[PDB]
Structure formats: structure tokens, C-alpha cells
Amino acid sequence: LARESSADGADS
Amino acid sequence: ARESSADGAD
Amino acid sequence: ADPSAKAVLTGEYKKDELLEAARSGNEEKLMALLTPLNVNCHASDGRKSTPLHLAAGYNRVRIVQLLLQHGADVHAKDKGGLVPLHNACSYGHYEVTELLLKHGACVNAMDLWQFTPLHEAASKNRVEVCSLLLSHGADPTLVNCHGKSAVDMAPTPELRERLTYEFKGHSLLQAAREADLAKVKKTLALEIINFKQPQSHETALHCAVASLHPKRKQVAELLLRKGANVNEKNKDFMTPLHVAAERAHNDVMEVLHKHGAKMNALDSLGQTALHRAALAGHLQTCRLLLSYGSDPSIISLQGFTAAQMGNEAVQQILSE
Amino acid sequence: DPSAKAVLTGEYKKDELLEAARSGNEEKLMALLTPLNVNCHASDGRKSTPLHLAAGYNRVRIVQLLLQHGADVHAKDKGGLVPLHNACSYGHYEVTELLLKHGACVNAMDLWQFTPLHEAASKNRVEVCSLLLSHGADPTLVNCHGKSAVDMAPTPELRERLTYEFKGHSLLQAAREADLAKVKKTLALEIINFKQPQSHETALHCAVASLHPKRKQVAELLLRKGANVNEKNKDFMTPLHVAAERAHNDVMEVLHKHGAKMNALDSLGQTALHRAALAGHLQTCRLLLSYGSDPSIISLQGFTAAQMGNEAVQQILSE
């Protein structure tokens, strides 16, 4: 039900 | 803890 | 009972009656009880308000005026650090707020939690009081102890937008009154009249003179009246005149000329608007450009005059 | 059994391909990548495709190779994210531009109606937002909670910038259509024309009234940025009226240079010249006359400038 607030990836 | 209500009225 | 302690006790009765008169708007009673010794008295209990706090919060405009006129301290604090301006603003009392400001109330006064009068007005959706406060220099970006500004507390998008707009507006007016040139420039840094398409470096004026639609002349005039740079160059060093000339949009060329368009401005190929008109075979465009003082002898970077790029009819027009 | 053995080891190839995409291992990706697995999904986590992973972990070369070899920019993970979301959420500018150049939808929506601009704006990726908006991102589209991309910007500086850019792009389009009414409208809301809500004065009235020595340069700047030279305050006073009555001659010259209407009338039917005459500003009257002020104009109360002035004024106005 609740949106997961992380897509696959990371900060560069 | 701040009291929200100053003395006065609408 | 000690004579001094009896005096203090009598004064405490009297001050409670003064406070009562202030709260209720009872002018005659106020002026019978008000002396230099109690004008800035505080209540013993509750918020420990002064007469001015109570008159302000309860919208007793005449009482506010009498207190200010007979020595009341516009900067007096209650037990939370509220000044009377906080009380007037929270309850949306516009006239009271204006009187307090006229008598020198500090527009961004902070209580012990760093709440300002604008936090109070904004949180309770006192739209007109917010606008009044902003007109006296209230700052809607100041944060209280919870990290929250008056913008954060405004309960509608409309009020939030208004706080931001009017703050910026009044910041510009005050910078203009002070002739603070650096502050004027900062406040105008995000005007959009010369906004540029990030890839092409084109402005609204380049877009308007390129338009096929009927009111392009009127739109171009408007943009120019409202601060469009008439000679702004895109990525290819084309001015609006180059853009209009190559499309034979003659009506807007007239407008550009009238606003100081530089006739012999050179694109990145060393071409004038006249080269571009000539190359496209736009006969009236060429005549017009010549009549505005375009120089027919200019040689492009490819080594061509306008006449060397044009048809027979263009060559004739240019040899006149 | 033969159809199941092929599928089983093909499923191991996948996990290795997906690993190669996230890690940036070019040699390994190209050894494993085929037309049949380029758009596979992970069996666990987000169920990302290689391109989601490449995009999210800023594997610019891997993204390029995947796109070149048939990867689908429109592929979804389990929450409806397309690879453009991943790139935007982690601020990978060059990846975002590459995906956009290969036809990624700039306003793609996940299951909760989050666009790539919602992702960029929420994570404070200011340059990425500018790029998205440059490619037609709509910052008025709302997610499933009624929140725009502008609403998700966590600082007021970013909200201000997003608003600037979307207004700029909208002005450009309105200009292409020669929509007179819409350009007229949006330029009315620019701060240069802000009016004091009671007095109705603009920055230009304020500037010409200023007692500070940069007033000339400030008036010049306001006028260059589009201030209305003839704007009226509550009393129908133009900046020219304001300057003339104070003998601020320096800024009167600026106003004249920008085409101020010399004979504009206040609420009493008076010109700037009536106001200068009445105050006894002799040089100011002279300057106004040289600029084409009409001394014959009669106010609503029945007076010319000369009828309101002292002898020296009357001399100036006849000579």
C-alpha cells in the first residue's frame, strides 16, 4: 500500500 | 511548552 | 499590616481594575484608573499581560490609542515574550495592528519560541493583517524554534503565494526608497521578460517575431514595452530582427526598428538581417531594411554581400 | 525437461547481467547481453531492468550500450518507475539527458503518480529539474496525494527556481502563439510592477522620491527592466509629478529619456509643471518646459501653473 521512497541507484 | 493562545478574542 | 504592604495591596486591586477596563473597552474607567505608576502594569496571573496587550487582543481601538497616548510601552512583553503586536495579529485586529506599528512596534518581534507577529497572522489565516505586516517590513522567511517560517504556517497555497509575492514586492519598494542598487538587482534577478530557452538562448521576443499568429505585432510591442532586450542574440548570434527578416514578418520588423533594433548586427556567419531577407527572396523586407539604414555593402564570412546571395529582383532593389 | 533446463540456466544469466549493469562491468554485460534478456526484470527487490540499474547507479557507458542494444526506456519496475525516475532521483544529469534523447517520457508516472520531476525536486536535484523542465516536464501535474513537483521541493530557494523556470518556458510558448492576453497577464505579475497596496506607488515612484545618491542609477535600472514610466499612484501622480515637486532633476531626465508623458494629469488635473510651479522650483520648471511641458494647461480648480506660482516662476514660464 505505502510507496517505497527508494528506487534502485545511489548518489554520485 | 508554548501556550498557543495570546490574551484576546476574535 | 505594614504601610508599604498595604499600599502595594491597594495598587494590585487598582491594577486589576485597570486591566478589566482595558479588556472590556471601558474608556471612562480606564482614564480614571490610569496613572504613570500602573500604565505598564502586568496581570498577576495567566499570561501576565499589560493593559496594552489586553486592549490589543480584544480589539479595543480607542483604548489602544489612549494607552499609547498616555505612556504605554509598545515593547512590553507578556510571560511568553509576546508584545501587544502579537495579540493584535493573532486575532486579526487590523486597525489595532496599524496603530501599534505607527507607534513603533517592531514588526518582526520574537517571543521566547521565536514566533513573530507574522507567524501569528499567517497561522490563523489573517490575510489582510499579513499584507499590512509585510508592508511594514515583516519577513516571512524567519524561522521559529521549530524551524518553521510564516510561509510554512500559512494554511492555504493562496496565502503562501501572497506572503512570498508581497515580501518580494515590499523588498523592492524599500530598496528603491533607499536607492540600494545591489538590493534592487537581487530582487529583480528572477524576472522572466528576458528568460532564455536554455539550449537556443532565445527569448520571448525571438519567439513572438517568429510567430505565424495574427497579434504578433501587438505581442512584440508589449514585450518591448515591458523590458524585452530588442537586440538579444540567440546561440547563432541572431537578433529578433534576423528572425523577423528571414520570415518576411514585416510588421514586427517595424516595431523592432522603432525600439532601436541594430540594423547591421551580424549573425555567426557575419550576415545582417538584410543578407537573410535577400537569401530568402523577400522583396518588401529588403526595401524596408534598406529604408531603415541597413548597409548593403557588408560582406559575410563566406565572402558575400546580400546582392551576391539574391535573385534578380533583390539585386535590382539593392543597386538603387 | 529440455525446455526447463534452458530456462533455469537462462535465469542465472539474468542475475549476472543485472549485477553487471549495477556494478558498471562493461566486459561482463556485453558477454551476457542478448536480444532475449536486454529487458529482463530482477525476480526480487524492485524488479528493476538492467537499464533501471544502469540509470540509478550512473553507469553512463552501460546506459549507452543498453539503449544501443534494444533496451526499453518505457519498462517499469514493480512500482511503475521507468529508468528516467531512477536517474532523476539520484541526480545523474548525463544519464537523464541520454534517456530523454532516446525518447523517455518526461512526465512518466509511477503507481502513485510521481513524475521524474517529483523525484528530482524532492531530492533537491536543481540542475536535473532545469533539464526536465527544459524537456517539457509539467510541474503542475499532481501525484496521488494532490502534490505537485513544486510542492515537493524541500527548500524555498528550489521552489522559487522551479517557479521561475516554468513561468519562463510558459512565456516562450505564449509568445510563439502571439497570445496577447496571456503574455499581458503573466507580465502583470512580475515584481517590477508591484504596487504598494494602499498608496499604489511602484518601485519607480519610490526611486524618484529617494534622498540617496544612487537614485538616478536605480531609476534607470527599473526603467530598463520594464517599469511603466507613467504609472499612477492613488492620487494619479506619475513618477514625474513626484520628482518635479521635490526638484529631483536628475531622475526627471531619466524619466524624460524613457518617454514620460510630460503633461500627464494628477487627480486635481495638474501636470508636473503645476507641482513644480507651486513649490517654487525654478530650475525644475525650466527643465520641464524644455522637455515639452505645456504651460497653458488649466487644472480642475481653474489654474494654470503660472497662476499658482511666484513672480520668478511666472518669469520662467513666459521667457
User: Are chains D and A in touch, 3+ Cβ pairs below 8 Å?
Assistant: yes
- Residues C42 and C178 placed together within one structural domain of the fold: yes
Query: How far apart are alpha carbons C249 and C229 in whole angstroms?
Result: 19
Q: Min CA distance, D150 vs chain C (Å)? A: 11
Q: What would the DSSP string read from start to end of D132-181?
A: HHHTT--TT---TTS--HHHH-SSHHHHHHHHHHHHHHHHHHHHHTT-HH
Asked if residue D53 is part of any domain, the answer here is yes
Residue in D189, D202, D224 nearest the CB of C227: D224
Q: Given C188, C205, C233, which residue is the final one in a domain?
A: C188
Query: How far apart are alpha carbons D24 and D66 in whole angstroms?
Result: 12
Burial of C48: CB neighbours in 10 Å, binned 0-12, 13-18, 19+: middle
Cell triple for D148: 505537485
Q: Which domain holds residue D154?
A: 1-177
Neighbours of D93 (CB within 10 A): 17
Q: Does the distance separating the beta carbons of D213 and C177 come in below 8 Å? A: no
Asked if residue D184 is part of any domain, the answer here is no
Asked if residue D183 is part of any domain, the answer here is no
If phi > 0 it is left, if psi is from -120 to 50 it is alpha, else beta; for residue C311 that is beta
Nearest CA to C142 out of D206, D14, D156 is that of: D156
Solved with: X-ray
Asked if residue D73 is part of any domain, the answer here is yes
Cα atoms in the 13 Å half-sphere on the side-chain side of D76: 8
Q: DSSP secondary-structure letter at C298?
A: P
- Residues D220 and D146 placed together within one structural domain of the fold: no
Query: How far apart are alpha carbons D183 and C188 in whole angstroms?
Result: 19
Asked if residue D182 is part of any domain, the answer here is no
Neighbours of D187 (CB within 10 A): 23
- Tell the residue number behind the cell numbers 508589449, with chain if given: C222
Q: Is the separation of the CB atoms in D73 and D103 below 8 Å?
A: yes
- Residues D277 and D306 placed together within one structural domain of the fold: yes
Q: Min CA distance, A7 vs chain D (Å)? A: 6
Residue in D58, D85, D112 nearest the CB of A7: D85
- Residues C113 and C152 placed together within one structural domain of the fold: yes
Q: Does the distance separating the beta carbons of C113 and B8 come in below 8 Å? A: no
Nearest CA to C261 out of C281, C242, C234, C285 is that of: C242
Q: How far is CA C206 from CA C196, C228, D227, in A?
A: 10, 10, 21
Helix-strand-coil percent breakdown of chain A, rounded to 5?
A: 0, 0, 100
Task: For chain D, list residues whose CB is within 8 angstroms of any CB belonging to chain A.
Answer: 22, 45-46, 48, 52-53, 55-58, 77, 79, 81, 85-87, 89-92, 110-112, 114, 119
Size of interface C-D (CB pairs under 8 A): 155
Q: Given D177, D203, D235, which residue is the final one in a domain?
A: D177
- Residues D33 and D133 placed together within one structural domain of the fold: yes
- Residues D133 and D17 placed together within one structural domain of the fold: yes
Query: How far apart are alpha carbons D108 and D115 in whole angstroms?
Result: 5
Cell triple for D48: 528493476
Nearest CA to B2 out of C194, D114, C110 is that of: C110
Specify the number of domains making up chain D: 2
Angle of the D282-290 helix axis to the D272-279 helix axis, nearest 10: 160
Nearest CA to C224 out of C250, C256, C195, C254 is that of: C256
Query: How far apart are alpha carbons C137 and D259 in whole angstroms?
Result: 32
**R_g of chain A computed on alpha carbons:** 9
Q: Does the distance separating the beta carbons of D87 and A10 come in below 8 Å? A: no
Query: How far apart are alpha carbons D309 and D276 in whole angstroms?
Result: 9
- Residues D152 and D204 placed together within one structural domain of the fold: no
- Residues C231 and C87 placed together within one structural domain of the fold: no
Neighbours of D70 (CB within 10 A): 12
**Amino acid identity for residue D34 in this structure:** T
Q: Min CA distance, D126 vs chain A (Å)? A: 14
CATH of the domain at C99: 1.25.40.20
Q: How far is CA D129 from CA D158, D159, D207, in A?
A: 9, 11, 36
Query: How far apart are alpha carbons C115 and D262 in whole angstroms?
Result: 49
Asked if residue D262 is part of any domain, the answer here is yes
- Residues D146 and D272 placed together within one structural domain of the fold: no
Query: How far apart are alpha carbons C248 and C229 in whole angstroms?
Result: 21
Listed in sequence order, the residues at least 6 apart from C237 whose beta carbon sits closer than 8 Å to its beta carbon are C265, C266, C267, C268
Q: Is the separation of the CB atoms in D135 and D169 below 8 Å?
A: no
- Characterize D262-297 residue by residue with b for buried, 16 or more Cβ atoms within 10 angstroms of its Cβ, and e for exposed: bebbbeeebbbbbbbbbbebbebbbbbbebebebeb
H/E segment holding residue C317: helix C312-319
Q: Given C165, C188, C211, which residue is the final one in a domain?
A: C188
- Residues D12 and D91 placed together within one structural domain of the fold: yes
- Residues C120 and C231 placed together within one structural domain of the fold: no
Residues of C in Cβ contact (< 8 Å) with B3: 47, 80
Query: How far apart are alpha carbons C134 and C140 in whole angstroms?
Result: 8
Model resolution, angstroms: 1.9
> Cα angle at C11 between C7 and C14, to 5 degrees?
145
- Residues C154 and C242 placed together within one structural domain of the fold: no
User: Are chains B and C in touch, 3+ Cβ pairs below 8 Å?
Assistant: yes
